[PDB]
Structures are given as structure tokens and as C-alpha cells.
């Protein structure tokens, strides 16, 4: 019932190999819907979901202009961060930013987000109050002072409480047939003998949307968290996701094991056993 809009910016320097690359992608929930790549011959914000294609030229012109400006601003920012950490011109570095808004089933703002990382380490984040910053170190304190002087937090609050939520609700309505449709997993349990002594039970969940899912193995009703191998939820490429959970069981004890599946698309949570 709740939804999110997020943008993910990646800026990466590559000294000796041109100017830093700037990439930006937008998501609603687990659905990508736009992209921008400064390495393109003619960089533009481009559609990646059918329900955004109906936006007019003024939309695509705005998003392209913002991203082209961001390409330059993030290049300047990467130069600034190199200075803050006394880093040589010779190394490559990464600046990442993720921001956006969460809304409830009624469309009201639950929380806004703006977080940044430098070389994979948290750097600065807008606090949940949308009014103050948390800086990770003395370099990020310099960014904080710049952003306080530019009244950045006030602008984030305005965006996050306003246009972010308004456009997210617009997207949720234009893409309702997919964005507001939870597809349940198709499930099954496989059995892979290892030895005469034990075998693997693997519980599969396929074709589900959104990616949030719980797969657990119980033995005599007790969760086997420590003994369960979970793979990372992975995309099928058709918008849906896949996941499995595996446990190693003593031969002949298989019926003491139950796989439990929780997912928004299911009428009721599932309990599964190996069916030989």
C-alpha cells in the first residue's frame, strides 16, 4: 500500500580518460522509469517505463536540462571532495546520491530522504526533520556549511513535501495497472541429495513483484535462520523478481521442514513442504 520515488545519481571521475561520468536513474518502488547518462552522444533524460512516455516535451526538456546542469555541478563537486581529502589528481573517485519521498496508501508524505556517499562511505545526509544535516566527517562539514548558506534544507523540504509527493501520486495513477499491482510468487520446493547422510531442500519464489519477500525454513516449527542459505533477490528482467532459500537436512527428516513465504501479492502466507 505504501510507495516510494527515488533518484540515484552516480558521478565517477576517471583521470586520463575524460571528464567524470554522471548517471541518473529514477524508480517508483522497484520499477525504473527514467535514465540519463552523460556519456551518451546526445545525453537526454529517457523513458524506461511505458507509463512515463505520455509526459510531454516540457517534461523531458526539464529533466534533461537538470541532468545536464548536474553533470557540470557533480564534476565541480568531485573536484571539491578531492580537495577536502587532500587526494591526488591521479585517482578515480565516486560520488553517489539517493533521494526521494515515501507516501502511504492515502498518498501522504511518510518520510523524505536525501543521502550522499563518497567512495562508498556515507558522507552527508538530510535528517528526517528535513531541516538539518548529519555530516560524517570534517570534509562533509564543509559541504554542510555551504548547503546551510544556500538554504538547501529549506528547498529539500519544499521538494519532498510538495512536488516529489505530487508527481509520485501522478506516476502511481498513470501506471496503476503495474505499479499498484502486486504479483505473487510462483513457489516450489526441490530436493537435492548431497550424500547418504543429508540433502538440500530449496524453496523457490519466482515471478513476484515488488521485490520485498520473506522466505524462511522451519524445522519442527523453529526458524532455521542460522542454517538457511538465502540468495540475494534477483531480477528476472520482465519487472519480476526471483529468490530461493536453502537448508541442508538429514536424510529422512525432510518432512520436519516447512518453507514459509510471505508476499504482498498472496491472499494468505504460504507453508510449503517437499512433495516427493
Amino acid at each position: 500500500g505504501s510507495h516510494s520515488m527515488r533518484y540515484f545519481y552516480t558521478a565517477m571521475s576517471r583521470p586520463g580518460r575524460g571528464e567524470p561520468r554522471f548517471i541518473a536513474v529514477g524508480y517508483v518502488d522497484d520499477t525504473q522509469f527514467v535514465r540519463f547518462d552523460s556519456d551518451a552522444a546526445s545525453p537526454r533524460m529517457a523513458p524506461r517505463a511505458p507509463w512515463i512516455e505520455q509526459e510531454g516535451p516540457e517534461y523531458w526538456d526539464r529533466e534533461t536540462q537538470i541532468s545536464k546542469t548536474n553533470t557540470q555541478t557533480y564534476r565541480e563537486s568531485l573536484r571539491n571532495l578531492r580537495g577536502y581529502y587532500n587526494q591526488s589528481e591521479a585517482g578515480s573517485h565516486t560520488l553517489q546520491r539517493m533521494y526521494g519521498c515515501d507516501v502511504g496508501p492515502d498518498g501522504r508524505l511518510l518520510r523524505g530522504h536525501d543521502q550522499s556517499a563518497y567512495d562508498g562511505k556515507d558522507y552527508i545526509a538530510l535528517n528526517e526533520d528535513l531541516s538539518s544535516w548529519t555530516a560524517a566527517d570534517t570534509a562533509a562539514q564543509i559541504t554542510q556549511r555551504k548547503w546551510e548558506a544556500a538554504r538547501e534544507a529549506e528547498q529539500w523540504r519544499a521538494y519532498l513535501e510538495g512536488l516529489c509527493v505530487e508527481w509520485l501520486r501522478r506516476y502511481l495513477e498513470n501506471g496503476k495497472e503495474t505499479l499498484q499491482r502486486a504479483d505473487p510468487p510462483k513457489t516450489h520446493v526441490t530436493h537435492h541429495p548431497i550424500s547418504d547422510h543429508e540433502a538440500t531442500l530449496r524453496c523457490w519464489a519466482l515471478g513476484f513483484y515488488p521485490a520485498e519477500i520473506t522466505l524462511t525454513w522451519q524445522r519442527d516449527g523453529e526458524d532455521q535462520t542460522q542454517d538457511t542459505e538465502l540468495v540475494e533477490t534477483r531480477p528476472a528482467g520482465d519487472r519480476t523478481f526471483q529468490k530461493w532459500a536453502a537448508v541442508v537436512v538429514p536424510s529422512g527428516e525432510e518432512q520436519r521442514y516447512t518453507c514459509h513465504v510471505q508476499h504482498e501479492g498472496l491472499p494468505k502466507p504460504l507453508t510449503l513442504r517437499w512433495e516427493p
Binding site: 540515484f8 552516480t10 565517477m12 548517471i23 536513474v25 524508480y27 525504473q32 535514465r35 547518462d37 524506461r48 585517482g91 578515480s92 565516486t94 553517489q96 539517493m98 556517499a117 567512495d119 562508498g120 562511505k121 556515507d122 526441490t190 537435492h192 530449496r202 523457490w204 519466482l206 540468495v231 540475494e232 534477483r234 531480477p235 528476472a236 528482467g237 520482465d238 526471483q242
Partner: protein, 100 residues
């Protein structure tokens, strides 16, 4: 400098049936920095016209990418995914486990 080695999963979009058209996926995730080399191999030779998703990243800042191509599995043909990253001394080859 944080560096994180990629996790690699090789799998099909739909349950694999010989002679039926499908998509072969190689999903790389959890890595940092973002530069990565990924090829899909058919009996050891690099497949052309492989596509990939746009660069994005997880809440822990690690990157993920899906590489994929249309394919038709057979009982002979072997498929794999060849991954190179700054964390890797030599490219990693992960074979498509048709046995699940």
C-alpha cells in the same frame, strides 16, 4: 578506499526448456566501484548483442547490474558468465547451473 567484490548469479528468466526461447541473465551486485566487465559465454565464446540495465545501487551504496540476452537452451550448449572487476585478479567465470 572501499572496494567490494561482485556477487554473481547466472540463471534464466523462465524455467529452462530445451528448444524454447528464453532469456539468459547474469546479475552482478554488491560491488564497488562501479566499473565492471561482464560477458555471457556460449560454450566459451562471447555472445554478441548482450544488453544490460542502467547503473543503480542499493541502500548500502553497492552497485548492481543485470546483463541479459535472448537465447534458446539445448542439452549440448553450455552457458556461463565472465566477470571482471578491480577486486578480481583474473576474470571470474560462473557457469549456468542448469541443475538449479
Amino acid at each position: 578506499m572501499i572496494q567490494r567484490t561482485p556477487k554473481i548469479q547466472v540463471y534464466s528468466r523462465h524455467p529452462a526448456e530445451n528448444g524454447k526461447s528464453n532469456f539468459l541473465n547474469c546479475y552482478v551486485s554488491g560491488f564497488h566501484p562501479s566499473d565492471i566487465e561482464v560477458d555471457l559465454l556460449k560454450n566459451g565464446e562471447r555472445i554478441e548483442k548482450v544488453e544490460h540495465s542502467d547503473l543503480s545501487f542499493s541502500k548500502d551504496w553497492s552497485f548492481y547490474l543485470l546483463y541479459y540476452t535472448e537465447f534458446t537452451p539445448t542439452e549440448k550448449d553450455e552457458y556461463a558468465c565472465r566477470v571482471n572487476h578491480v577486486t578480481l585478479s583474473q576474470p571470474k567465470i560462473v557457469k549456468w547451473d542448469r541443475d538449479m
